[PDB]
Amino acid sequence: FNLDVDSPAEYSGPEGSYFGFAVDFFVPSASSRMFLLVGAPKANTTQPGIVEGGQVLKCDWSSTRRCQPIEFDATGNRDYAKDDPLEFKSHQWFGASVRSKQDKILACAPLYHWRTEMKQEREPVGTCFLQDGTKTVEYAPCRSQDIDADGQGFCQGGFSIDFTKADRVLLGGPGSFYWQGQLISDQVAEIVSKYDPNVYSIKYNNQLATRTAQAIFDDSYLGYSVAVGDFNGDGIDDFVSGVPRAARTLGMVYIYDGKNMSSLYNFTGEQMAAYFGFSVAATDINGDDYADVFIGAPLFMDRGSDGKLQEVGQVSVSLQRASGDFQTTKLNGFEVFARFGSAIAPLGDLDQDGFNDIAIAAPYGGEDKKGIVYIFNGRSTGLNAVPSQILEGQWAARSMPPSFGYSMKGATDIDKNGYPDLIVGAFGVDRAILYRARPVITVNAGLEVYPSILNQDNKTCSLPGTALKVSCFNVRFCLKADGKGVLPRKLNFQVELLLDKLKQKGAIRRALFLYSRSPSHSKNMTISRGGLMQCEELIAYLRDESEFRDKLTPITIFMEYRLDYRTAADTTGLQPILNQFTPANISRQAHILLDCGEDNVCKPKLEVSVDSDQKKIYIGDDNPLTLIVKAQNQGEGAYEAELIVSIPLQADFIGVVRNNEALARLSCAFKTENQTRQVVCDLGNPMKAGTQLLAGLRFSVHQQSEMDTSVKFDLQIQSSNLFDKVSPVVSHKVDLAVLAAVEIRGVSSPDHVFLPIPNWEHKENPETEEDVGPVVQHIYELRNNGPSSFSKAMLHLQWPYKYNNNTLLYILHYDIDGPMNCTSDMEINPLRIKIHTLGCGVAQCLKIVCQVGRLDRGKSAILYVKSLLWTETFMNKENQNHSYSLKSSASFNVIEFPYKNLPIEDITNSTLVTTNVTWG
Amino acid sequence: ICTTRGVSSCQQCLAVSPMCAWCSDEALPLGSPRCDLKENLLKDNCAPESIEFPVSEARVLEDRPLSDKGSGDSSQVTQVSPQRIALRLRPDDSKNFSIQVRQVEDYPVDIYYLMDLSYSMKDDLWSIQNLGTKLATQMRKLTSNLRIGFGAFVDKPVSPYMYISPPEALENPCYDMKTTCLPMFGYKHVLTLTDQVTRFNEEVKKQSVSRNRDAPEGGFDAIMQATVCDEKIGWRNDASHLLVFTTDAKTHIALDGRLAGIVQPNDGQCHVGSDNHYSASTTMDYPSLGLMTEKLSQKNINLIFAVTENVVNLYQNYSELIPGTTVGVLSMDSSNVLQLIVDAYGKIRSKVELEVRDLPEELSLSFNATCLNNEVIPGLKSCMGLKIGDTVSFSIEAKVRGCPQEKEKSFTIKPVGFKDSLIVQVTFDCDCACQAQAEPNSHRCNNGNGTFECGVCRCGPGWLGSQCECSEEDYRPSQQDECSPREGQPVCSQRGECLCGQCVCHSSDFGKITGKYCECDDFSCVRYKGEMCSGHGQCSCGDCLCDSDWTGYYCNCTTRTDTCMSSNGLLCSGRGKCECGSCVCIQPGSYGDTCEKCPTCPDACTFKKECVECKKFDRGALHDENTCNRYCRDEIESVKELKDTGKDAVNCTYKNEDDCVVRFQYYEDSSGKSILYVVEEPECPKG
Ligand SMILES: *[C@@H]1O[C@H](CO)[C@@H](O[C@@H]2O[C@H](CO)[C@@H](O[C@@H]3O[C@H](CO[C@@H]4O[C@H](CO)[C@@H](O[C@H]5O[C@H](CO)[C@@H](O)[C@H](O)[C@@H]5O)[C@H](O)[C@@H]4O)[C@@H](O)[C@H](O[C@H]4O[C@H](CO)[C@@H](O)[C@H](O)[C@@H]4O)[C@@H]3O)[C@H](O)[C@H]2NC(C)=O)[C@H](O)[C@H]1NC(C)=O
Ligand SMILES: *[C@@H]1O[C@H](CO)[C@@H](O[C@@H]2O[C@H](CO)[C@@H](O[C@@H]3O[C@H](CO)[C@@H](O)[C@H](O)[C@@H]3O)[C@H](O)[C@H]2NC(C)=O)[C@H](O)[C@H]1NC(C)=O
Ligand SMILES: O=C(CCCCc1ccc2cccnc2n1)NCC[C@H](NC(=O)c1nc2ccccc2s1)C(=O)O
Ligand SMILES: *[C@@H]1O[C@H](CO)[C@@H](O[C@@H]2O[C@H](CO)[C@@H](O)[C@H](O)[C@H]2NC(C)=O)[C@H](O)[C@H]1NC(C)=O
Ligand SMILES: *[C@@H]1O[C@H](CO)[C@@H](O[C@@H]2O[C@H](CO)[C@@H](O)[C@H](O)[C@H]2NC(C)=O)[C@H](O)[C@H]1NC(C)=O
Ligand SMILES: *[C@@H]1O[C@H](CO)[C@@H](O[C@@H]2O[C@H](CO)[C@@H](O)[C@H](O)[C@H]2NC(C)=O)[C@H](O)[C@H]1NC(C)=O
Ligand SMILES: *[C@@H]1O[C@H](CO)[C@@H](O[C@@H]2O[C@H](CO)[C@@H](O)[C@H](O)[C@H]2NC(C)=O)[C@H](O)[C@H]1NC(C)=O
Ligand SMILES: *[C@@H]1O[C@H](CO)[C@@H](O)[C@H](O)[C@H]1NC(C)=O
Ligand SMILES: *[C@@H]1O[C@H](CO)[C@@H](O)[C@H](O)[C@H]1NC(C)=O
Ligand SMILES: *[C@@H]1O[C@H](CO)[C@@H](O)[C@H](O)[C@H]1NC(C)=O
Ligand SMILES: *[C@@H]1O[C@H](CO)[C@@H](O)[C@H](O)[C@H]1NC(C)=O
Ligand SMILES: *[C@@H]1O[C@H](CO)[C@@H](O)[C@H](O)[C@H]1NC(C)=O
Ligand SMILES: *[C@@H]1O[C@H](CO)[C@@H](O)[C@H](O)[C@H]1NC(C)=O
Ligand SMILES: *[C@@H]1O[C@H](CO)[C@@H](O)[C@H](O)[C@H]1NC(C)=O
Ligand SMILES: *[C@@H]1O[C@H](CO)[C@@H](O)[C@H](O)[C@H]1NC(C)=O
Ligand SMILES: [Mn+2]
Ligand SMILES: [Mn+2]
Ligand SMILES: [Mn+2]
Ligand SMILES: [Mn+2]
C-alpha cells in the first residue's frame, strides 16, 4: 500500500526492441551505487551481420534515467568452415531472461541457433553469457553433442534462469528430448574456470541435470520457469520449475533436490490449458522461515455469478509446513482476458511489518487493457487474499499490448529508505517503471475528558467575553508517531476536534470551547519520532442549563488527525504514509449529570441471566444454538452499557433474533481484537434504571477435538461508570451429544431366477461357474448418515448355505469396500471354481462376521457377496415344481465411538435380502 | 408500510416497494394521505387522474409464429418466439415472460471440413476423395439446402515447429526421408462453402500433406480463423453451422508460442487475406479456450472434434471447457467421418440451451424450463434429448435491485448456435412525473429556499413540512408527538432525539440512518460466515437485497445448477433435488455430489425392462406418462438367442402382466451408445 505512484522512475528503450521483457536489480559489491538491469530482446546491436541480436541495458538510479548496453558478446557468427556459419545469433532474443547475483550478471538468448558441427542444421539450442566485472564467459549447457530434437538441439536453454544462495545457477530448457524439458544446474565457479573459447561443448564437474524420459512426457515444457528455495532441512536451495503442458496440458510444477536433482514434490493444475506453471516464485510469506510456493495459471477459467466459465487466471499459494505436504489456497483474478497470474514477484517486506509481501500482475487488464499489478501483504495466517494496492500502466498500445507487468522484480532497496522497491517492465511500449516504497508511520493518539460527567450547576469557569461562571471541562489530545527506515525527525500533523459529534448539521451543539466560542478547533501539532506523546489542552464549557433541553444524549468528543506533506525525504518528494489499518480518528463521550442520586454518582446494579432453551449440541455438524439473555439494570443509570458475550473457539456468531416481540431486537457486533473472541451488544447509552431487556443471539457450533464435553459461554454487562460498572460474570454451558443415524441396506442382483436355466446340463463334478448356475449377487451396505461418527462396529451376515445336505447359494467370492474386514466360519468356494421361504433358520447357516473401523458422515462400508444358484438341488427330484424364497439377513452393532467421556448407549438394526426362484 | 417509514418525497416513495404511491393534491388533506398503497390512497381523496402508481409491464413488440419447415420463400424461419419484448420495471419489482424454441424440420446446414494435414494424415486425405458427394446423399435426408467447404492446417511455419534447414527442406520438408511433401502452412482455406458437392471432391486430391517436427499441431489457430472469417468462408447466417475438426494428435494451446518467440496475444479478428492463408500465423500466439468459446458463441458455430482413439480422452476434457462442442472417435484412415458427421448433427440438434448477452447487472434472470410434455423443471435454462421438430418452452423472470437512470438498455436471450433471438428492452421508471413542474422553489413554504415538489416542500436547513425551520431551539416543543408510533415509549427510534416533528436521525456513523422514525438503517442485516448478507446482497433496513444469482434470507443460496450436473447430463441423476447448487438425494440408499453412487439400488434390469415394456409392448408405466421414447433413447431390436457376444453385457429376465417370461440383453460401447436385444417369442404357458 506504500508504493509511490506520483513520481516513479521512467525508463525507455528503442521502440520495437521489447525493452522491458525482463528486469532485475544490480547490486555490485564493489560499489555503493545500484542499477537497473533491463533486458531488451529484438534490439539491434553493433554485432556485424546480426539483425536484432538483443541487448541487456544498465540503467542507473542517478536520476539521469540513462541506459547503457552491457558489452556481453560484441561479435558475429563464428564459422564452421568457409561460408558456413556455426552459429546464427540473429533474432536470438538475447535478454529474454536476466538475473544477477551480487556482482555477476547472467543473460541468455533462448532462440540462439546452432549448426551442430555434424550436419548443416539450425537448431535453437540457446546460449547465455555470465559477466563478472570485465570477464565474460559463455554458458551454453545445451550446446552439446546430443544434437537433434531427441537430444538438446531445441532445448532453448536459458528460457528461464535463477541463482541459488551459493553461486549456483538454475537453467531451464523447455525443448530438450522432444520438449519434455530439462533443468541444468552448474557452479558459477565451474562456469568461469572451465570456460574455453576454443571448445563449443564444455563438460562441467558437479553439473546437476534432469535426464530424458518416456515419450508420454513429451511436449511438457519443463523449465518454462524457475525459482529457488529450500523445501527440506538441508539448508541448500532446491529447484522449482513449472511444467505448463505436463499431464495432458493440466500443468505441473516440479521441485528437485538442490543437491542430487532428485524429485521432491509435485503440484498439478485443476483445469486444462490454464497453463499451470507459466510463473513460479518462492518466498516466506508467513514469517515462519519456511519457503512458500507460488504458481501461476494465467489462463485459468473460474465460474462467475451466472455459472459460466470466464478466463481470469488463478495463483496457487502453497504454504510449507515443517512436516511435508503443503497447505494450499487459491486466488483468482478479477478481469476477463487479463491473465492474472502472468508474473509473480516477491517484494521482500514492502511495509516492514515483519512479514514478506508479494506482487501478482495482470498485464492485459484494467483501463484500455493497459496492465495492472496487485500488491499483497503477508500475514501470520499466510497471504492476505485482499489486494493492498493496484498499479496501473500509464502507456498506450501503439502496436501490441503494452504488457505492463509482464516482468517484475523487487526485494531490493534501490534507495536507502529502508523499504524494498519494485521494477515493472512493459516491453509492449519498450519502457520500464521503478516504483519506490514510501516509509510507513504508525501513530497512536489518546483523548481524555476532565471529567467525563458534567454538572450544569457546577459553574466554575468564567467565560472570557462576559464574567459569568459556566460548567466547563478539559479535552486533552495526545499524539505519538514513529516508524522504521529513513524518516524525518519531527512530523507535522493537523488535528481537528469536534464537540458533541452526534448532534450535527442541525441541532443544539450543547458544548463549545471556552475561548474559541465555537464547536470546533484546530491545532498545528509537531512531534518527534521516538516516543514523546506530545499533548495539548483546551477548555470546553457546557451551554446554559436552559438552552438545549436535551439530556441523556452523550456529548461525544471527536478528534481526527491528518498528516502534512511538508516532511519528505531528500529523495525528491518521497513523502511517508500512515499505517494501512490504523484509525485516523478517536472519540470519547461525556455525559450530563442526571438522575444519579444525592451522591452525584450513578451506581448501577447490572444483572445477566441466560436460560437453557437448547439442551444438546450434536457432534459432527453445525447446529442452531440460540441463547436468550436477560440483561437488567436495577440501579442508577449506566453509561455506555454493553453485553460482553465471550464465546469459545467454535462459536461463529450469526445475527440476532427478530421474529419475536417477547425479546426485542438488539444492535450487536462481532469483534476479535485482544487475545479474545467475543460478541458485543449495545444495551443503552445510558441504560437507565429497570430496563429488563430480552434478546436472542443465534450461533452455529463447529465442534472441536472430539474429546470435549461442553461448550463455554461467559456473559457480563460493562459500563463506563466509576463504581459497580460491571455485572457478575454469569456462565452457561450446553452439553455435547452423540447422534449417529446408522443404517444398513441390502439388495439382490438379480432378485429373481426363473427356472429352468437355459442351456443347463448336470456335471456331477463341475468347475465352470456355468455348470453350477446363474450368478446371484447380494450387496450389503452399512452407512453412517448421522453427524457423529463411530470408531468400531460389528456386522453379522447370515447366509443360507444348504438345506438338507445340498447347496442353495454356493458362495463363489466376497469383496469388501471400506474400513471393514470379514471372515467366514466356513471355507468359501471349497470346490475351487473360478470365474417356500428358506432363511438361515429352517435351513443350514453359513455366517460371515465383519469388523468395521471408523465411519464418518459421508462414508460407508459395503460387502459384495457373489454366489451361484446351485441348480442341481432345485429342479431334480424333491424341489421339482416349487417356488422358493432364498432369504439372507444382516445385522450390525455399533460398539465404540471416538468420543470417550460422553454418553453413547447403543446403535443397532438389521435388514434382509431375498432372492426368489420360481417356475414359469 | 408505505403509510409510514417511506413518506419522505416521491422518487423515493416508489423505491420503498412496488406497492406504494404518491399524489398531488389540488388541495391538501393533511390527514394521512401519505405514500400509501393504492386502494388505501384510493380510499380518501386525490384521484383526479393523479395517483402516480406505475405498474410493471412485459408488453411484447413482435412475436412471429414458429415455422414448420425451414425452407423457401415463407421467409424468416423463426425458430424462436416471441422475438422482441418491451420490459418496463419499477424499483425492486419483477415481471415474468415466456419464450419458445423449436428445432425446425428442414433447416439449412453448411459443413466446413477443417482437416489436419501433417504427414500422418496421408491415408486420411485419400479415403475422403469421394466422401463429399457421399456426404451429400446422407445429409440430403435431413436438409435440402446443404453447403460444404474445406480448410487445412499444419502448424506455425516457424522454428522450432517448421523444418528450417537444410535450405532444400523449405520446398520439401520431406527431404531427409527421400520423399516429397509440399511446404508447410499455418492455415489454408481452399474451398468456400458451396452447394456443389462435386466441387468439394475436386479440391480434395488437389491437396497434399506436409510435414512438421513437434507432435502438437496448431488447429486452434485454424478453428479461430474459420470462425471469425465468416465473410471469407461463407457461413450462411440462416443455416446450422458445423465446423469439423479432424486431427490425430495433441494440440498447441495459448502461450505455447513463447518458445517460438511469439508473445502477442491472439485477437479474435480475421487475418486470412486474399491469399487464403493465415498471415498472422507466425506473429500471433495460439488462442485460448476462453477466446475460442467467445467467438464460437458469437458466430453460432458448432465445433465437432473428430479425433482418433489415442487422443480422444484429451479432446473430451477439452470439450468440457468449451460447452456445446462434441467429440467423435475417428478411424486412422478417416473412413468414419461420414457417419461421424451425421451422428454429430443429431447430438447438436438434440439440445437447446439459452444464453444471455448484454444483460445489465442491475437485474437478474430466473429460468423454469418445460422440456417434456407438461412437466416443468425449475432452475433450468436448457433442454436435453430432443429430436428435430420438437418445441420446448422457458418461463423467465427479470427483477431489478432498485433502479438506475441507465436510459433503457436492452439485452438478448437466445439459444446457442441459433440466429433467432428474443430481445428484451428494459425501461425503468424510478420517479413520479410530477417532479418536472416548473414551480422551481418559491412562495408558500419559507422563501428561504422553500420548494414545490409533487405536493410537499422539503425545505432547506429545517423542513417543518408545509412550513419551515425549527432549526435551533425555535420550538419549545409544539409538535412533540407522532415521533414514536406507539406513544408510550421513547419518542424516536431512540436514535434521533425528535425535534421539529421530523425526527432528525443522529449518530450518522458506521453507515447511515434513515426512516421517518429512524427505524431503518444499513449494517443491521444478518451474517452467515461472518459477512453481512454473506457479502452477496445489499442491506436495506435489516433486509438483504440479494445480488444477481442469489436467493434466500441470507443471500447464501445460489441459483446455479452446474455444480448439480452429472456426467450423464441430468442434475442429481434423477435421484434427488438440486437446492442451492447442491444435490439432496431422494432415492433411498443413494448419495454422492450428484446422487450418482447407489450400490444398493436395483440393477439395470429393473430399469431397462421399463423400456422393453413400453417400446416393445406399448404398455406398463413410462407409457401412461408418455415418457417412453424420451427416457428410452436406447436402441431396441427384437432378436433371437442372445448370442453371448460382449463382456460388458447383462442378460435380464422378467414376467410381464401376461405371465410370459421375457428375456433381453443390455450392452454399452466405450463412450458409445447402448442397445437392448429383446428375444422374440417369450416363454408362455403351454396350451
Ligand atoms: C513428480 O512428478 C513427476 C511427473 O511424472 C514424476 O516423474 C516420473 O517418475 C517416474 C517414476 O519415478 C519415472 O519413471 C521411471 O523411469 C525409470 C527409468 O526409465 C527408463 O529407462 C529406459 C531408457 O533409458 C526405458 O525403460 C523402459 O520403459 C519404457 C516405458 O516404461 C519403455 O517404453 C522403454 O522402451 C524401455 O523399455 C524408459 O524410456 C526409461 O527412460 C523406470 O525404471 C521406472 O519404472 C519403475 O517401475 C518399473 C515397473 O513399472 C520398474 O521395473 C523399475 O525398476 C522402476 O522402479 C519409472 O518408469 C519418470 O521418468 C518420471 N518422469 C520425469 C519427467 O521425471 C516424479 O516421480 C514425481 N515425484 C514425486 C516426488 O512425486
Ligand atoms: C445459509 O445460512 C443459514 C444460517 O447460517 C443456514 O441455516 C441453517 O441450516 C440448518 C440446516 O441446513 C438449519 O437446521 C438444522 O440442521 C439439521 C441438519 O439435519 C436439520 O435437520 C434441522 O432441521 C436443524 O434446524 C438451521 O436452523 C439454519 N440456521 C442456523 C443454523 O442458524 C443455511 O443452511 C445456509 N444456506 C446455504 C445454502 O448455505
Ligand atoms: O509426433 C511427433 C513428435 C513425437 C515423436 C515421438 C518421440 C520420438 C523420440 C523421442 C526421444 C526422447 C523422448 N521423446 C521422444 N519422442 N512428430 C510428428 C510430426 C508429423 N510427421 C510425422 O510423424 C512423419 N513424417 C514423415 C515424413 C517422411 C517419412 C515418414 C514420416 S512420419 C507431422 O508432420 O505433424
Ligand atoms: C534492426 O534493424 C533491422 C535492419 O534490417 C530492422 O529490420 C527492418 O525493418 C523493416 C521495417 O521495419 C523491414 O521491412 C525489414 O525487413 C527489416 N530488416 C530485416 C533484415 O528483416 C529492424 O526493424 C531493426 N530492429 C529494431 C528493434 O529497430
Ligand atoms: C466542578 O467542575 C469542575 C470543572 O472543571 C471540576 O474541576 C476539575 O476536576 C478535574 C477532575 O475531575 C481536575 O482534573 C481539574 O483540575 C478540576 N479543575 C479545577 C479544580 O479547577 C470539579 O471537580 C467539579 N466539582 C464538583 C462537581 O464537585
Ligand atoms: C483389517 O485388517 C488389517 C490387517 O491386519 C488390520 O490392520 C491395519 O494395518 C496394519 C496391517 O496391514 C496393522 O498393523 C494396523 O494395526 C491396522 N491399522 C488399522 C488402522 O486398522 C485392520 O485393522 C483391519 N481393519 C479393521 C476395521 O479391523
Ligand atoms: C418456478 O417455480 C416456482 C415454484 O415455487 C415459482 O415460484 C413461486 O414462489 C412461491 C414460493 O414458495 C411458490 O410457492 C409459488 O408456486 C410461486 N408463487 C406464486 C405463484 O405466486 C417461480 O415463479 C417459477 N419461475 C418461473 C420463471 O416461472
Ligand atoms: C538424494 O539426496 C537425499 C538428501 O540429500 C537423500 O535422502 C537421498 O537418499 C539421495 N538419493 C539419491 C539417489 O540421490
Ligand atoms: C474515522 O475512522 C473510521 C474507521 O475507523 C472511518 O470509517 C471514518 O470515516 C473516520 N472518520 C470519521 C468517523 O469521521
Ligand atoms: C420373494 O417372495 C417374497 C414372499 O413374501 C416377497 O415378499 C418378495 O418380494 C419376493 N422377492 C422379490 C419380489 O424380489
Ligand atoms: C443330512 O446329513 C446328516 C449327516 O449327519 C444326517 O444326519 C441327516 O440325516 C441328513 N439329512 C437328510 C435329509 O438326508
Ligand atoms: C431400525 O430402523 C428403523 C428404520 O429407521 C427404525 O424405525 C427402528 O427404530 C430401528 N430399530 C432399532 C432397534 O434401532
Ligand atoms: C407469472 O407466472 C408465470 C411464470 O411462471 C407466467 O407465465 C405468468 O404470465 C405470470 N403471472 C402473473 C400473474 O404475473
Ligand atoms: C479426462 O477427464 C476425466 C474426468 O473429467 C479424467 O478421469 C480422465 O483421466 C481425463 N483423461 C485425459 C486423457 O485427460
Ligand atoms: C446371455 O445369454 C447367453 C445364453 O445363455 C449366454 O451365452 C451369454 O453369456 C449371456 N451374456 C452375458 C453377458 O452373460
Ligand atoms: Mn534443500
Ligand atoms: Mn512460509
Ligand atoms: Mn509485509
Ligand atoms: Mn526503497
Ligand SMILES: [Mn+2]
Ligand atoms: Mn447515586
Ligand SMILES: [Mn+2]
Ligand atoms: Mn502431425
Ligand SMILES: [Mn+2]
Ligand atoms: Mn507441430
Ligand SMILES: [Mn+2]
Ligand atoms: Mn492416418
